[PDB]
Amino acid sequence: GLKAAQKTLFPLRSIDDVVRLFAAELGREEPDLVLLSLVLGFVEHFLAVNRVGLTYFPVADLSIIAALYARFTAQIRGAVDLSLYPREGGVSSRELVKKVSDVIWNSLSRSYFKDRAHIQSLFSFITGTKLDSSGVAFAVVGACQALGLRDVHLALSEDHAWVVFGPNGEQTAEVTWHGKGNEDRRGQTVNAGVAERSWLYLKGSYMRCDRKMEVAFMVCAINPSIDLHTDSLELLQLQQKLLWLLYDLGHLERYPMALGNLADLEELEPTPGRPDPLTLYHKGIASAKTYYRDEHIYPYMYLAGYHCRNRNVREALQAWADTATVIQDYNYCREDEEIYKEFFEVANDVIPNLLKEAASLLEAGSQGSALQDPECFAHLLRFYDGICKWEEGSPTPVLHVGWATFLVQSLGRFEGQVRQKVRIVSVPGPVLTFQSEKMKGMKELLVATKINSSAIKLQLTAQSQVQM
Ligand SMILES: NS(=O)(=O)c1ccc(OCCCN2CCC([C@](O)(c3ccccn3)C3CCCC3)CC2)cc1
């Protein structure tokens, strides 16, 4: 409306006043996404974008929030005539959804840095005419709810956003851009992407949000960064509390990455009486396994990063091998580059630095060292096997000589007597089966006393010939 009952909690004078607002909206049949996004972008603006004047918490007076709310709703209602788009079943049509998308798109500034911080909210849309990629999709959803279109919902994969709608919520529509350069399928289904088994569309195991999960998304979208070096403590705490509130209400059940975000926040600043980060990261993984057929990559990476920051080398390598075990059943397609970059950085920067440190600490007399544990070697091998398998049948290559260099260095960190304890068995403590043809052909090289660097390179990149 706003409705009288949504107004009684104003002004919001503190973090807990914001949380109380979220609680009361989440009590409702339909939490108000426009109200809540405006409030978050407001508080984010005055705690991270401009802190001038801040003495505690930027007071969100009803007069300010209501006028922002009225601007959004007038802008949408004025520009979308619902009577031109008749609704059977209480469900929306593709043309209606496209028009709402076009409205949001056309309101945006022509040129701006599309990956700035703080352009995710309806606050940024209204005050700055700017939105990031997935912010456009959220905004389309908000606009749809404000028009009474309750079939329209946010869909998310690990790197993109679109909408679902229509009979049984079975239709999909592209409403925003993806990445740098991707030309458009705006208005189309995602079924081509699903059918080609790219990571971008998660072989169809992407998130189909209900309203509560859309609130969870805007809370994950809170960006506490003030600059490269500094975070807003007030926004970190707000985000954390909001996530716990969503957790207790059961609204993070089908949101794996939200559980990873919470775990990260708990590591930074733990809440007395709550599960530890590890429990959290494992619920994020169990959520992916239960609702998304274990087809998601980030739950394992979040866990891996935690183990990496704490120097549990063994556990970090296990998590990354689990990561690769997911990716192996995808095809590497155009538009999957963000997950290529994540794997590239693991293999070729993070793991080599972890293992270099472990080599020094071994020289310094460390026991139980990753580099003396054959299970750690097996995890490293499983990691690469999954990447190799991922590459098979993909329309674009993954591996090249730049990866081979780090592979050779990483294998060399483990002595022969440690590498030879891994048992590699065929289809048809440490025991390991390779699914990839590259790693199967490599198996003897990997356990040789002397690592044959040139042969490993040839096997990893399938380079036919050596120097004339
Ligand atoms: N090197 S590592 O330790 O293995 C590691 C690497 C990446 C990691 O990434 C964790 C961050 C994952 N991130 C969260 C924001 C998320 C997203 O950027 C986002 C943005 C806004 C709100 C919710 N999610 C997406 C969701 C789909 C569309 C945008 C994309 C995935 C963690 C660890």
From Swiss-Prot:
GO terms for cellular component: chromatin; chromosome, telomeric region; cleavage furrow; cytoplasm; cytosol; endoplasmic reticulum lumen; histone methyltransferase complex; MLL1 complex. Keywords: Chromatin regulator, Disease variant, DNA-binding, Nucleus, Phosphoprotein, Repressor, Transcription, Transcription regulation. Ubiquitous. Changing residue 131 to W: In parathyroid tumors; somatic. Changing residue 284 to D: Found in isolated hyperparathyroidism; likely pathogenic. Changing residue 220 to F: In MEN1; loss of interaction with KMT2A and JUND. Its main location: nucleus. Changing residue 302 to A: Reduced interaction with KMT2A. Changing residue 378 to P: In MEN1; also found in isolated hyperparathyroidism. It is found in: Nucleus. CDD domains: Menin (cd14456). Changing residue 414 to S: In MEN1; sporadic; with Zollinger-Ellison syndrome. Changing residue 403 to R: In MEN1; no effect on histone methylation; almost no effect on JUND-binding; modest repression of JUND transactivation. Residues 193-365 are annotated as: Interaction with FANCD2. Changing residue 260 to R: In MEN1; loss of interaction with KMT2A and JUND. Changing residue 21 to R: In MEN1; no effect on histone methylation; almost no effect on JUND-binding; no repression of JUND transactivation. Changing residue 118 to D: In MEN1; almost complete loss of histone methylation; strong decrease in JUND-binding; no repression of JUND transactivation; reduced interaction with KMT2A. Signal peptide: none annotated. Component of the MLL-HCF complex, at least composed of KMT2A/MLL1, MEN1, ASH2L, RBBP5, DPY30, WDR5, HCFC1 and HCFC2. Component of the menin-associated histone methyltransferase complex, at least composed of KMT2B/MLL4, MEN1, ASH2L, RBBP5, DPY30 and WDR5. Interacts with POLR2B. Interacts with POLR2A phosphorylated at 'Ser-5', but not with the unphosphorylated, nor 'Ser-2' phosphorylated POLR2A forms. Interacts with FANCD2 and DBF4. Interacts with JUND (via MBM motif); inhibits the interaction of JUND with MAPK10 and the phosphorylation of JUND by MAP kinases MAPK8 and MAPK10. It is linked to Familial multiple endocrine neoplasia type I: Autosomal dominant disorder characterized by tumors of the parathyroid glands, gastro-intestinal endocrine tissue, the anterior pituitary and other tissues. Cutaneous lesions and nervous-tissue tumors can exist. Prognosis in MEN1 patients is related to hormonal hypersecretion by tumors, such as hypergastrinemia causing severe peptic ulcer disease (Zollinger-Ellison syndrome, ZES), primary hyperparathyroidism, and acute forms of hyperinsulinemia. Essential component of a MLL/SET1 histone methyltransferase (HMT) complex, a complex that specifically methylates 'Lys-4' of histone H3 (H3K4). Functions as a transcriptional regulator. Binds to the TERT promoter and represses telomerase expression. Plays a role in TGFB1-mediated inhibition of cell-proliferation, possibly regulating SMAD3 transcriptional activity. Represses JUND-mediated transcriptional activation on AP1 sites, as well as that mediated by NFKB subunit RELA. Positively regulates HOXC8 and HOXC6 gene expression. This is Menin.
